[PDB]
Amino acid sequence: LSAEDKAAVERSKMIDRNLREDGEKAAREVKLLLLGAGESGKNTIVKQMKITGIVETHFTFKDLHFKMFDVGAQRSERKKWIHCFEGVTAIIFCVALSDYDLVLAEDEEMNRMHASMKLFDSICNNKWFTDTSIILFLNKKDLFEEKIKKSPLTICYPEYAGSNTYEEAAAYIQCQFEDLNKRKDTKEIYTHFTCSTDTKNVQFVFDAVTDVIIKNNLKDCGLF
Amino acid sequence: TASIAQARKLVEQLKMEANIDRIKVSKAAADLMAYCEAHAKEDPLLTPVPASENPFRE
Amino acid sequence: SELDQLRQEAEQLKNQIRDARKACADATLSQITNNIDPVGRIQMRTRRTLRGHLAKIYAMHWGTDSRLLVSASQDGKLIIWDSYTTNKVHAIPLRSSWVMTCAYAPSGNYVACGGLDNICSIYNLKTREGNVRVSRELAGHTGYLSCCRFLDDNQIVTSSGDTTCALWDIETGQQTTTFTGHTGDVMSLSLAPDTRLFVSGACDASAKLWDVREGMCRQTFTGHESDINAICFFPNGNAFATGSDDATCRLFDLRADQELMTYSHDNIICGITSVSFSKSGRLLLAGYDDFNCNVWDALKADRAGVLAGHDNRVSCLGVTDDGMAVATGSWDSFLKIWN
Amino acid sequence: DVQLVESGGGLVQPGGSRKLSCSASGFAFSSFGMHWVRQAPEKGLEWVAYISSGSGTIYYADTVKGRFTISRDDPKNTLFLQMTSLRSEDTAMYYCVRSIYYYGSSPFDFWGQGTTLTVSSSDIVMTQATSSVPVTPGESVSISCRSSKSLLHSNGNTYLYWFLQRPGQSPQLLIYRMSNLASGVPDRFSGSGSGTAFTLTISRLEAEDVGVYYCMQHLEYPLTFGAGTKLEL
Amino acid sequence: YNYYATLLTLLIAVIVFGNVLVCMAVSREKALQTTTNYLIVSLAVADLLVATLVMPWVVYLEVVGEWKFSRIHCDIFVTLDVMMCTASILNLCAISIDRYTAVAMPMLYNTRYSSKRRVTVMISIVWVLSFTISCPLLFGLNNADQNECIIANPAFVVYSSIVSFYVPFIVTLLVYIKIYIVLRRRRKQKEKKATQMLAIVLGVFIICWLPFFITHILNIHCDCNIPPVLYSAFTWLGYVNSAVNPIIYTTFNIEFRKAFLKIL
Ligand SMILES: CCCN(CCc1cccs1)[C@H]1CCc2c(O)cccc2C1
Numbered sequence A: 001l002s003a004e005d006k007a008a009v010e011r012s013k014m015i016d017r018n019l020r021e022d023g024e025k026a027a028r029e030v031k032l033l034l035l036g037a038g039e040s041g042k043n044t045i046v047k048q049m050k051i052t053g054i055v056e057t058h059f060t061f062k063d064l065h066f067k068m069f070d071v072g073a074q075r076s077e078r079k080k081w082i083h084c085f086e087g088v089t090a091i092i093f094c095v096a097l098s099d100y101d102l103v104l105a106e107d108e109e110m111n112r113m114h115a116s117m118k119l120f121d122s123i124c125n126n127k128w129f130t131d132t133s134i135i136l137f138l139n140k141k142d143l144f145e146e147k148i149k150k151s152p153l154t155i156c157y158p159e160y161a162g163s164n165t166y167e168e169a170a171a172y173i174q175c176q177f178e179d180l181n182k183r184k185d186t187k188e189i190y191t192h193f194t195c196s197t198d199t200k201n202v203q204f205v206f207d208a209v210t211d212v213i214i215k216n217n218l219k220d221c222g223l224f
Numbered sequence B: 001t002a003s004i005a006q007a008r009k010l011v012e013q014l015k016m017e018a019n020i021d022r023i024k025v026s027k028a029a030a031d032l033m034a035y036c037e038a039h040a041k042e043d044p045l046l047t048p049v050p051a052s053e054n055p056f057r058e
Numbered sequence C: 001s002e003l004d005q006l007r008q009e010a011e012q013l014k015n016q017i018r019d020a021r022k023a024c025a026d027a028t029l030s031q032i033t034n035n036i037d038p039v040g041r042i043q044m045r046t047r048r049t050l051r052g053h054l055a056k057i058y059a060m061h062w063g064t065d066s067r068l069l070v071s072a073s074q075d076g077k078l079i080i081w082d083s084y085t086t087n088k089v090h091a092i093p094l095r096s097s098w099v100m101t102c103a104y105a106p107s108g109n110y111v112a113c114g115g116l117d118n119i120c121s122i123y124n125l126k127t128r129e130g131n132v133r134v135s136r137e138l139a140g141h142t143g144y145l146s147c148c149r150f151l152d153d154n155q156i157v158t159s160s161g162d163t164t165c166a167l168w169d170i171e172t173g174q175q176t177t178t179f180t181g182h183t184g185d186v187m188s189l190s191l192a193p194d195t196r197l198f199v200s201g202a203c204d205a206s207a208k209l210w211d212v213r214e215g216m217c218r219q220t221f222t223g224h225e226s227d228i229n230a231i232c233f234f235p236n237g238n239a240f241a242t243g244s245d246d247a248t249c250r251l252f253d254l255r256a257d258q259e260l261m262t263y264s265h266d267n268i269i270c271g272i273t274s275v276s277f278s279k280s281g282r283l284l285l286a287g288y289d290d291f292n293c294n295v296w297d298a299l300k301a302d303r304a305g306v307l308a309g310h311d312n313r314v315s316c317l318g319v320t321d322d323g324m325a326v327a328t329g330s331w332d333s334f335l336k337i338w339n
Numbered sequence D: 001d002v003q004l005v006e007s008g009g010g011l012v013q014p015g016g017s018r019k020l021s022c023s024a025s026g027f028a029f030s031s032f033g034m035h036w037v038r039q040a041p042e043k044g045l046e047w048v049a050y051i052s053s054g055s056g057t058i059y060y061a062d063t064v065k066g067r068f069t070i071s072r073d074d075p076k077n078t079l080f081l082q083m084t085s086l087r088s089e090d091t092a093m094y095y096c097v098r099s100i101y102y103y104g105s106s107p108f109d110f111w112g113q114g115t116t117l118t119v120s121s122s123d124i125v126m127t128q129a130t131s132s133v134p135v136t137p138g139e140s141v142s143i144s145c146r147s148s149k150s151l152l153h154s155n156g157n158t159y160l161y162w163f164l165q166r167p168g169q170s171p172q173l174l175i176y177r178m179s180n181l182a183s184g185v186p187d188r189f190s191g192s193g194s195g196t197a198f199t200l201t202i203s204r205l206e207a208e209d210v211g212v213y214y215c216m217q218h219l220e221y222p223l224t225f226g227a228g229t230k231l232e233l
Numbered sequence E: 001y002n003y004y005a006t007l008l009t010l011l012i013a014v015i016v017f018g019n020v021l022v023c024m025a026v027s028r029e030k031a032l033q034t035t036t037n038y039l040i041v042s043l044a045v046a047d048l049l050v051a052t053l054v055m056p057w058v059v060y061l062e063v064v065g066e067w068k069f070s071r072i073h074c075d076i077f078v079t080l081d082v083m084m085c086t087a088s089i090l091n092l093c094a095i096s097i098d099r100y101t102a103v104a105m106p107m108l109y110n111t112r113y114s115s116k117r118r119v120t121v122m123i124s125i126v127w128v129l130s131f132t133i134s135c136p137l138l139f140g141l142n143n144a145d146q147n148e149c150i151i152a153n154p155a156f157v158v159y160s161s162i163v164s165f166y167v168p169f170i171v172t173l174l175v176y177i178k179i180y181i182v183l184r185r186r187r188k189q190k191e192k193k194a195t196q197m198l199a200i201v202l203g204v205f206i207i208c209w210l211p212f213f214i215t216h217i218l219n220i221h222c223d224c225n226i227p228p229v230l231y232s233a234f235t236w237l238g239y240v241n242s243a244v245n246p247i248i249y250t251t252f253n254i255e256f257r258k259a260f261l262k263i264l
Helices: A003-026 A042-050 A082-087 A112-124 A141-150 A166-178 A198-221 B002-018 B025-038 C002-024 E002-028 E035-053 E055-064 E071-104 E106-110 E112-138 E154-178 E192-221 E228-251 E254-263
Strands: A030-036 A055-059 A066-070 A090-095 A133-138 A189-193 C046-050 C057-062 C068-073 C077-082 C087-093 C102-104 C110-113 C120-124 C133-138 C145-152 C155-160 C165-169 C174-179 C186-191 C197-202 C207-211 C217-221 C228-233 C239-244 C249-253 C258-263 C272-277 C283-288 C293-297 C303-307 C314-319 C326-330 C335-338 D003-005 D017-025 D033-039 D045-051 D068-073 D078-084 D092-099 D115-119 D126-128 D132-134 D141-147 D160-165 D172-175 D189-193 D197-202 D211-217 D229-232
Touching: A003 C077, A003 C087, A003 E112, A030 A042, A030 A082, A030 A112, A030 A198, A042 A055, A042 A066, A042 A090, A042 A198, A090 A112, A090 A198, A112 A133, A112 A166, A133 A166, A133 A198, A141 A166, A166 A189, A189 A198, A198 E035, A198 E071, A198 E106, B002 C002, B002 C217, B025 C249, B025 C258, C057 C326, C068 C102, C068 C326, C077 C110, C102 C145, C110 C145, C120 C155, C133 C165, C155 C186, C197 C228, C228 C283, C239 C272, C239 C283, C249 C283, C283 C314, C283 C326, D003 D092, D017 D033, D017 D092, D017 D115, D033 D068, D033 D078, D045 D068, D045 D078, D045 D092, D045 D211, D126 D211, D141 D160, D141 D211, D141 D229, D160 D189, D172 D189, D197 D211, E002 E035, E002 E055, E002 E228, E002 E254, E035 E055, E035 E071, E035 E112, E035 E228, E055 E228, E071 E106, E071 E112, E071 E154, E071 E192, E071 E228, E106 E112, E112 E154, E154 E192, E192 E228, E228 E254
Parallel strands: A030 A066, A030 A090, A090 A133, A133 A189, C057 C102, C057 C314, C145 C186, C186 C228, C228 C272, C272 C314, D132 D229
Antiparallel strands: A055 A066, C046 C335, C057 C068, C068 C077, C077 C087, C102 C110, C110 C120, C120 C133, C145 C155, C155 C165, C165 C174, C186 C197, C197 C207, C207 C217, C228 C239, C239 C249, C249 C258, C272 C283, C283 C293, C293 C303, C314 C326, C326 C335, D003 D017, D017 D078, D033 D045, D033 D092, D068 D078, D092 D115, D126 D141, D141 D197, D160 D172, D160 D211, D189 D197, D211 D229
16 A cells, blocks of 8 residues: 555544544534424524524533524425435424414415314325334414414314314314324323423524433434 | 417417427437447446446455 | 417427327337347446445436546535545535536536535635635526536536526626526536537426527427436436436437337336446446336447445436446445446 | 745855744635755755644654754744754755645645755755756656655555745746646646656646656655756756 | 252243243334333343343253353353343333333423433343442452352442332332322323233233342341252242243233234
8 A cells, every 4th residue: 555545544534533523523413304384483483592595503401412404495306305304303494373263365264273284194194204203393373372362273174173262273273283193102292382482492492402312312212 | 468478478388399390200309229238338327337347346 | 369379380380290290210229139130138236335324325426537426415425536546535514505406627627516505616626725614605596406517627518397497607607698498497418529519408308408508498399298307318418317307218319309218127116316327338237116226228228227326216327427336326325336 | 926935045064053944825725734955065955854733743864863953933923943053964954834634625736936045164865867968948848756665655645745946036836746737838738657767748848837846745754856957057 | 859950941942932022012112112121122132131131041050050161161151140130120111211201201201302212211221230239250259159149248249239120110219109199199091001000010020139139138137047949939039020021011011912913
């Protein structure tokens, strides 16, 4: 092996050393999709948690680095780029509760809530996310609690209990989404009703991530 | 309105593509096959070189 | 009135070109090749495993020198490898993890890669400083970059999630011709050997051919079902192959203006993710969802071999420009070079 | 620009000590292997020492092995050579020299302007066809060099480097293996050889081609230069 | 005694069979090649070296009631008995510490870079410590007679029993109690299955080894007789753990069920 090839093998080992020291960092980050049915309170949680193409954001909270991929700028065919995210710890998903009686701007026929259920079913029951938990923020809590007094929830659903109190209406939204999960044994949905204090929304991501990672570890150990 | 401009554009593209000279598949296939025979001795994956010529010796 | 008249003229012209294609279809490449000697078993073996990426490999490309290859991964690292000796020649920290594509220039001076950030970053390998750095970020795409190919050190063509391809002047950092004729988003490019033409495949299962200076599609090929993931030109430039989620590969000839062959076998149920020809044109190599590459006699459409060595989805192929080897990349994070 | 500047040394007593220093700037120094080369007054080049990029793989010439220690501090982009028991034979100009090794790279491609050091009072020998040749611009010249071993390695590449030192300058790489020209070098120069004996041809001289031309080998450490042919106007 | 010799021979085959399938399963599937599952291979290898380097010769000794070989063969054989059993018990303790890391320090278990260092350390400490505790037998410091070379030297037997069983047993019991303090603070078949696994695993490791390492110290502390059938039966009940180990540590994990059904 020549004097230059020995220095080129060294260089290759120098590249490997630093390339592996970067893997030692990139494996300690927690990787999260962030998804939502258009303008859906998603941008509000991004600024709370911090305070073209996909936007990636970084935060550390209680000594644990998260990388969050706001993919909502990719308008096109998920079937040809969502397989990138197979290694995600948990999807974060957003729905503005106010969407129950708004209608989708491209046709004004379907409720923005039903459009977000089509997206939730579409990401949830997809083959790449079969083990991937979903954190589900339900975002515009306050505006839904006000609006349901003016506009009953049956304007969204043909089938409902007709109760129309905020608690049983909000819990019926959560129930209607968690019923979309076709694989409740392989993935758990972590629904949360989003609130004004930044650290309460961040703590829920940290809790659901820590609980997803423990349930993944227990599935490695054979304790599950 | 704009769906008409899009359909005029798409029709003009289809007309532009329709006007192209297209040759017999027998001739096209035979030229593809004839190139492929002519370069056959020049392809180390098709017809492997001896180990001393191969840069990827074990 | 007029929109329905134009829709009837679109139907009429679609009917006229399918009749014109069926008129010049006087044979099949299977009939024309009935007399030729079959390839036999292509028992290639892994001569190197390049084992430094720490996440899914999404693209790789050979240098014209046919010894160096670039590869890119979800690690947010792009690596240039000495394929003869497994050395990392360079490793390049990307600004983003999300590398859907990479390419390497015909002179080896420059590397390009794309991603879910729609920017094509172009990296100068042969700087006077010893670190690789960005020349341009080519930002004007509306959806993720699915493919990249340099025509030369100062022109690149790219394809995207926005249904367009674009040709860029890498000096001024802007599109020069821009190509819009697909309806599905665009997944793969190949340049003709002369680099004046190119052909791109999209999720509408149309493949469209362009001239890079004319700025407009000459031909549309549409024999596929489903969705085209992969394209390569056959080395004469008069034909190209396509790989789909329709588990078949297909060979289209430009002068015939249509499909010649359809490479399928009943137990490949799954998408082709990448395609390349071997230097004679005689072998298609096709990479699959079912964790391997198949190898096909491109003239007979018999399966001539398998590159079985990957433990996750093969996402790449490239035969070297000298024909000496095939690299394969996969989601298992190793490249394997076969001969 | 890329730069190598050398706060270096000066006078010493024989048997004394000095620290040569070479601060690099304008390039990614942590990635380069660094050599020192030296040149005694009105004599040819001697390679002195090396460090690879990782600060592993240090080497020395047998004339300085154990007397000199070569060191680097990448967070300061700086290379050192610490000199102990300085002999009168160590009187020389010392050049810091960067090198980078990977397929298609050009090592020795940039050289520091050099520091004087002055003192009070087993390897491939490389050799060249003459002490000098007379020249004028627009002529062609074929410089030649001979190696005591075949430099054509089993990997196929041939480790003959060609340098030009213009009058009063630090050396410059012309050609990194037999035939591969450096960047910043004009198409006038072109090298070739059999594997033991070699040539550098200058196809149509310019007045800037005046100076001393050294071949060197890089097949084995210690690295060895020829005693360079002058081209004299 | 042909019937007892036959039943003892069948135990050898069961220990081999179960521990071979777990070695095959983790060798095949990348989904099985997690941190605990290399420790479960290391357990299964200790159980195989118990099955092969030890079982047939203890079975023959129990069948003939006499020792047929020179003291050097006893020094080798009984170093291997104490080593492979201690490597088996220390593997249970190492898997229990790994399962504690999986729950109490979950990011350290998760991380593929540092968790490979942990497997390398804990498999090495398991084997090195099991050799270390047996090494006085290879030095021949067991004063036993060549008529019946069962271990005789009381201070060694006590210390070997303590560090090979009572310590890793108390540490395993402690960490599987911590994996029932967590998993009972975090939570406040369902996750009940984790408590069912802790109950089965401690149940087996008590039931197989505790009767042996009790009697094997009591035979020194009591200054008294012990029934040979009881002392032997508890010795076999010890070796029965190496049959039970692969069954418990794999057949309850669904990815192992799949990997076994791919062989079977
Ligand atoms: C079931 C294991 C039986 N062996 C002893 C073999 C026999 C005993 C009586 C007749 S034949 C023990 C010996 C003592 C010891 C120890 O101090 C620590 C760890 C393991 C062992 C292994």
